[PDB]
Amino acid sequence: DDLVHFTLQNWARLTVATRAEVERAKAQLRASLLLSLDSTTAIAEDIGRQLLTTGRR
Amino acid sequence: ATTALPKTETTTLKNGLTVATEHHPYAQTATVLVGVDAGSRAETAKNNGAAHFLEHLAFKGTKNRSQKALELEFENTGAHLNAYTSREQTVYYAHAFKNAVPNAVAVLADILTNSSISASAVERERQVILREQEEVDKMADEVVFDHLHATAYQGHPLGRTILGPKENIESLTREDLLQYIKDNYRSDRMIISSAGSISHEELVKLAEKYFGHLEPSAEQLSLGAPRGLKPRFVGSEIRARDDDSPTANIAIAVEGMSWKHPDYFTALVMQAIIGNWDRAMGASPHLSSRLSTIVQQHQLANSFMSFSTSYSDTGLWGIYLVTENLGRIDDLVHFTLQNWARLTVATRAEVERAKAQLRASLLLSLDSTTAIAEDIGRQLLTTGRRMSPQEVDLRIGQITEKDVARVASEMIWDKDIAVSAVGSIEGLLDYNRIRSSISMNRW
Amino acid sequence: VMHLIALHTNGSSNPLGVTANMDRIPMNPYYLIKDLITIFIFLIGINY
Amino acid sequence: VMHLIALHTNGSSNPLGVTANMDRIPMNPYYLIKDLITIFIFLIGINY
Amino acid sequence: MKILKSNPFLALANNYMIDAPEPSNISYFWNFGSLLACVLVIQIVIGIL
Amino acid sequence: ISYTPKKVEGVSFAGRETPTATGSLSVVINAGSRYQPDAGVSHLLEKFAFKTTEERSALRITRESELLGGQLSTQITREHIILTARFLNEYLEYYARLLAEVVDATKFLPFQLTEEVLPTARIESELFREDILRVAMAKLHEKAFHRGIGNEVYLPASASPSISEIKDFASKAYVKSNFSVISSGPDVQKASDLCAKYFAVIPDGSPLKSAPTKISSGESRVYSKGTNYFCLGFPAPAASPELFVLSSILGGDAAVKWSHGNTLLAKAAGTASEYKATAVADLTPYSDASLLSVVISGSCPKAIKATASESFKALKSLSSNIPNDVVKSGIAMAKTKYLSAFEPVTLNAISASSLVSASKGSDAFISGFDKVTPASISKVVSSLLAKPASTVAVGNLDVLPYYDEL
Amino acid sequence: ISYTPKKVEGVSFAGRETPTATGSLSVVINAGSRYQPDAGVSHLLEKFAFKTTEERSALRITRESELLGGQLSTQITREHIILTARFLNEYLEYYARLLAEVVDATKFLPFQLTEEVLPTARIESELFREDILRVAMAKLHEKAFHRGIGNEVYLPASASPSISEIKDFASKAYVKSNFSVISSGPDVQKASDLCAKYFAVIPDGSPLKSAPTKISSGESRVYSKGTNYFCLGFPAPAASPELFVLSSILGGDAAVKWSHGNTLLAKAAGTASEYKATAVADLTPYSDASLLSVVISGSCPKAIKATASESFKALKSLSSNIPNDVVKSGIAMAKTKYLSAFEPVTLNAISASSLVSASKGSDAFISGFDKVTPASISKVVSSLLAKPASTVAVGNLDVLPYYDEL
Amino acid sequence: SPEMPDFSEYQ
Amino acid sequence: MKPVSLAKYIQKSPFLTKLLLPISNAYVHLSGYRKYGLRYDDLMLEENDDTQKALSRLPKMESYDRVYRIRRAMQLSIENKILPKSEWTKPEEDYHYLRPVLAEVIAERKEREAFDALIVKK
Ligand SMILES: COC1=C(OC)C(=O)C(C/C=C(/C)CC/C=C(\C)CC/C=C(\C)CC/C=C(\C)CC/C=C(\C)CC/C=C(\C)CC/C=C(/C)CC/C=C(\C)CC/C=C(\C)CCC=C(C)C)=C(C)C1=O
Ligand SMILES: CCCCCCCCCCCCCCCC(=O)OC[C@H](COP(=O)([O-])OCC[N+](C)(C)C)OC(=O)CCCCCCCCCCCCCCC
Ligand SMILES: CCCCCCCCCCCCCCCC(=O)OC[C@H](COP(=O)(O)OCCN)OC(=O)CCCCCCCCCCCCCCC
Ligand SMILES: CCCCCCCCCCCCCCCC(=O)OC[C@H](COP(=O)(O)OCCN)OC(=O)CCCCCCCCCCCCCCC
Ligand SMILES: [Zn+2]
């Protein structure tokens, strides 16, 4: 119960989020979106999924 | 075709040397024992630890034979030899094949009656004694019992350790050991006993051949008689805390009964009533002791043992608890003392069951020849005779529930106790709260 | 009662001001008798 | 208060009469609103 | 750990009024104790006045 | 002094008459860890001793035995299960009946296994695992022999046999043709008649069949921070007096109490590491095999390595020729040890092997000690060193040697 | 696609050019479990990476890396210690500086060891011990190679090195002449310049010394109730293309997703147990040794035994006359399987082993695949089966076979 | 380990 | 203490059993625990040592089925309903799955209840 309560409290706190946390999240997301592709299979899968779900890469 | 237990003969050699044999016709091995009625009590504050040092130096050479001439005299013929000392007597015993005993007896006599201690031997054995003392501290049982003995008869020679203080070990000289030989090794206070395949007549001849030159003591006393002031039992407590020990050993004892006390077998019967237990026993849940049931149901400890150590003019009677449930130590102590105090109103079935168990267990622990010889030696040393099984049965039969109630009321009911704790004893309450549980308030 | 409940969760102090989690003794009978003397002295005073 | 503290050690029973350890719900959201109806009904009874 | 489970008095309140397992099928006949408590409080206040 | 075999009503009997006031009764069932179908079944079957029978409950068996003043004990080896009970001689019939009932009808209640039997086995296995030397010796036994007697005697922490398996094994093992009766009371004829009358209702099955022992070699290693051990192991054929004489000649244990010793191992240790590492040797006979082992222990790994090399050299030195005095001393010591291994009424690893074997276990075995000659010992040693030995190393593994470096 | 070594300012370097937006920087150090002085020292030393240095606390390091958007990962293997850092190409200088600072100056605080380093190592050790296959392969390595690479990698549950041992091992292990720097970003010249500039103040120590690997054999048996396993291990000298082609010939898995395959091991399993026990072969190349292993796994012990026997028979028959088409297919598969291990940035056994030895590496090693004849493979196979193999059995030991009964 | 402290004053 | 039902005394005389069978059938229909699907042995109290020990000596499937039955009964009682006429507990499934175990436990406890009271008549 304590774990669920704290998880949902940290969820709900996001309405008063500070600039520094947003900047850190932006940097981490930008790094992670590129660090995943490290093989031909991964790149092909990413291209295929992007073309199948959106229409362009 | 049923055979009977062989009686033990007894003779004196015109010098006070008593010999006791239990002949075993169809036996291939044999055991010969030689004991002296002089333990670590006869020492003083200066020359303490001389008994253990003296025992250690026995098998290091004599005037006739030197070292490496004793081992080649024993290893060649296949004859084990061993010795140990206690707080009131010291013993020597050698066991060999049927044909090798008549020479082991001679070698033992040559070692005992005649000896030679050199300064080099002492300076060599000092380090061995120091290493033994440094090692002995690790064991919990020995430390706990030594602390209990020290805190019970404090201020008396009976309250010292057999090893002696570390300071004394590096200070003893040959003269003190020679004085100990000259004083406490006398024919009036010595004994030999065999329990193997050696005939009584042959042992008598060997004893007359290799022991008929000792000098009887000037103070012509009996065997096992008290020598000194009667020690005063002083209730106290000792706590040697150590938080890194997973377990916690506690020993609680009261004043017991001496060897010559007329309430000896009653104390033994009560000890059997309390009994002992162990968590690894197959029949642990089904024991017929209230303490065993209450301890097992709540898992209050790992084991416990009840002992009735007895000396010439005093003794101890208590329990030795080993536990691992740190936090419920007070409950264990309270229940143990409550069951101790409950003996004032003991029933009649419990007494009969304990009497039967004690009668069975008394003569069931003697199987090897070494054990029988040791029992003969001890029984002759302390009292002065080896009681026949008929006498033991008669003495046990006289016990009734009212005698148990009287003894428990005059010894256990609201009396001083001496405790000693080692390990993680943070949960063990103080002295007054412990003592308050030994006398029930409902009555 | 609330005062006592709040105090019980951390224990009492000592004159030295240092921690006392090393040598503790139970209340009875060690502190159930030390109070009797003060009780009787106060009784003497109020009765006079 | 003694009544409640003695009751709380084992919990309430149920109309069925069997053990209720298998299914339980906290008191805060459910039984704090099932008692309001009775309170208001008692108030309407006593005010008349 | 939340405050209600940490502070002594709040824990005392929580263990009896907020977080307390109860049978899930108790009927409307189990509410009379709260009514008794309310009536007792009303009596105490009215008598004091 | 030695048990005399006899067979009455299809029951194997072995009695001994001694002048004492107590007695003993035991059943040596050939259902040890060698014959177990799965892992740990023998241990649990042994732990089911003196449980609720068809005529009595565990409470009765314990409390009434306490009332009678007697002791009940059980034992498990790699080849046997021993149920014993010592008593005063006045209660022979009751204990004979109790042992017969336990062997024959010992109904296995499913709720006892999960309440009384399994936790005891777990505790015993944990206690055994705590002891380092026992674990090392068990590992050496497992490395030497393949699976016959190289199984695991105690229950592993990741096993849980069902009650059905134990019941099946009990129904297959507890038969009239798969055990014996050992008694050492002051009367033999009466005990023989009692055992013949009472142990005659168990159905006569057939003895369990096991494949002949397979001998190999191997080396195991493990890490520890405390004291270090290094054990050698030489699998050998069925035990003979020459093997006992050799084991006593190697020596390792002092005769005088506080001394060093003049045996080969003691001298090797003394001239190798100034008595900083102790070496002992002993022999463990079995039904159709034997294992002679040398154990070197200490706290300085360098000393252990040096004394191991010296002891191996000394053992290899025995293949050329032996002086007569060494042979005489070894013969005397071996005879003394073998005869002293018989005094207790409890069946150890030596007496049980003599009793199970029906070809002059003890009566002629003693007479074979005096006929040992240096040529026989040399031949035995030469035949022993053909195949490589098995080693177990505990402690610092960067200094403890392999077999190839000895 | 291939690392071209250099040596700038007495520092080993290995550059690589790729058309990607993210680089990397790994420091491969010869401080694995082969060179450790005592048990568990290498693992603890690896765990101390990225802790409080002489210029910034661990909290500062973690927060800075989080803000910059990078992943710091370490890796401990049987013969190396690898510290990696994946990042966007902008922060290459910062990450090179951080790695150089970590390797050069890293103060060892005892309370850090007692607080963070030890619990994490213990947790990783328990997580490894939970798995069964990894333990089996570790035991296979232990039985195959006596010391060096035969040492246990992870920290034993009953060991606890002091901080002084780790400190001195790090002092005598982190020197210029005992590691290399590997980068595979979109620029090599700039990375080489930065690495030469920052990895330059580390002292010129001496390379760690180890004895040549010693090869032996042995069998170990353990008990389990779940899935049964059986492994075969053939030690061999340094890897050659013949061994890779042989491993690809054995195969074991399926080329297409849902099928049984048509290699030797798949056919053996199908003909023996009707595909009830999957057999897989693999090769692990080390610096001066290699281990060709065959893993037979399944639930039915009898199927496992039959598959093992049939597989060993097939391996024995592989040395008679290999058809050319089999060799062609094996070479075609082995080329792809070897090349596919270089695409991932993080190093594995194959890439690290290739990079350690500069004599061949990857430039000429791949070129030698197309010059393999059936005679060469037959010679290699016949040389492998001269010395006895080594086995490790997990599960019901009464059915799993020893090596003498294959 | 030391000797027993002298308690004879309070006895 | 404990229930003292005397059905064993009645079953000695077949006359009484034959006379009383319809009354017992009507009474069991009137008690109406079958409408919730429960067995009769789920209604006995489990708050002492004997019943708590007996519940630990049941087969696993029986315990799981009992748990499901009690949960379903509670869920039915929450919304004040009963099972339809087709899902009521049939007489075939209304057997004693708890009495023998409890009787065995009580016998074991009673067994010990004697050694302590043992006296010597001399
Ligand atoms: C799980 O299962 C269970 C449930 O079931 C399913 C439950 O439901 C429950 C939970 C619910 C319960 C049933 C628990 C509740 C029941 C009880 C605990 C019963 C006990 C009830 C009481 C103790 C009653 C207490 C009532 C009191 C103390 C009345 C006093 C009222 C006041 C002090 C305020 C009113 C003012 C009065 C009367 C004075 C007059 C008014 C003025 C303005 C003049 C006074 C002004 C002054 C004197 C000025 C100065 C003031 C100062 C400074 C002093 C401070 C102020 C005061 C007034 C004191 C539980 C536990 C449970 O287990
Ligand atoms: C006049 C009678 C009523 C008078 C007012 C009666 C009501 C009084 C307040 C309600 C009861 C007190 C709250 C109890 C619950 C609580 O403690 O909330 C505090 C929360 C944080 O509580 P938390 O969810 O457990 O998170 C903290 C967990 N850590 C991080 C510590 C591990 O922190 C918060 O976010 C809020 C902290 C506020 C603390 C109380 C302040 C006192 C009230 C100020 C007045 C409010 C305006 C009143 C307008 C009517
Ligand atoms: C509120 C009080 C007002 C009235 C005052 C008069 C009371 C008359 C008491 C008579 C003297 C006591 C004789 C008992 C001696 C004894 O038996 O001591 C034994 C016990 C325990 O010792 P032991 O068994 O471990 O000893 C082991 C022997 N081998 O000690 C006690 O329990 C002390 C009890 C003293 C009375 C309590 C006083 C404290 C209450 C006031 C403080 C709290 C106030 C709370 C608000 C009211
Ligand atoms: C007679 C006077 C009584 C008080 C007068 C009425 C009080 C206001 C009631 C109107 C609004 C109710 C709140 C709506 C629900 C909500 O908004 O919150 C819901 C909360 C639960 O919290 P949740 O997180 O699960 O909610 C979901 C997510 N937020 O349920 C309540 O709090 C119930 C409030 C009732 C107050 C207690 C009534 C019972 C008294 C019991 C007496 C016990 C003995 C006392 C002895 C003195
Ligand atoms: Zn000594």
PDB file of N, CA, C and O and ligand atoms in Angstrom, chain B residues 52 55-56 129 132 163, chain F residues 258, ligand 5:
ATOM      1  N   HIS B  52      48.563 -29.153  36.522  1.00  0.00           N
ATOM      2  CA  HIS B  52      48.501 -29.375  35.081  1.00  0.00           C
ATOM      3  C   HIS B  52      49.896 -29.415  34.469  1.00  0.00           C
ATOM      4  O   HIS B  52      50.180 -30.252  33.603  1.00  0.00           O
ATOM      5  N   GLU B  55      51.362 -32.827  35.377  1.00  0.00           N
ATOM      6  CA  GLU B  55      50.809 -33.894  34.550  1.00  0.00           C
ATOM      7  C   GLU B  55      51.381 -33.841  33.138  1.00  0.00           C
ATOM      8  O   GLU B  55      51.693 -34.881  32.546  1.00  0.00           O
ATOM      9  N   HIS B  56      51.524 -32.634  32.584  1.00  0.00           N
ATOM     10  CA  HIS B  56      52.071 -32.486  31.239  1.00  0.00           C
ATOM     11  C   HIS B  56      53.504 -32.998  31.145  1.00  0.00           C
ATOM     12  O   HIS B  56      53.929 -33.454  30.078  1.00  0.00           O
ATOM     13  N   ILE B 129      51.924 -24.972  27.182  1.00  0.00           N
ATOM     14  CA  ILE B 129      50.871 -24.620  28.133  1.00  0.00           C
ATOM     15  C   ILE B 129      50.227 -23.294  27.749  1.00  0.00           C
ATOM     16  O   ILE B 129      49.000 -23.134  27.828  1.00  0.00           O
ATOM     17  N   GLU B 132      47.911 -23.859  24.826  1.00  0.00           N
ATOM     18  CA  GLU B 132      46.695 -24.526  25.284  1.00  0.00           C
ATOM     19  C   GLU B 132      45.754 -23.543  25.972  1.00  0.00           C
ATOM     20  O   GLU B 132      44.538 -23.567  25.740  1.00  0.00           O
ATOM     21  N   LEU B 163      43.988 -24.743  34.907  1.00  0.00           N
ATOM     22  CA  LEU B 163      45.149 -24.291  34.148  1.00  0.00           C
ATOM     23  C   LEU B 163      45.999 -23.318  34.956  1.00  0.00           C
ATOM     24  O   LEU B 163      47.233 -23.366  34.896  1.00  0.00           O
TER      25      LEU B 163
ATOM     26  N   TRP F 258      50.811 -36.806  25.184  1.00  0.00           N
ATOM     27  CA  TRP F 258      51.429 -35.557  24.738  1.00  0.00           C
ATOM     28  C   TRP F 258      52.787 -35.895  24.133  1.00  0.00           C
ATOM     29  O   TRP F 258      53.814 -35.879  24.811  1.00  0.00           O
TER      30      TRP F 258
HETATM   31 ZN    ZN J   5      47.064 -29.369  28.886  1.00  0.00          ZN
END
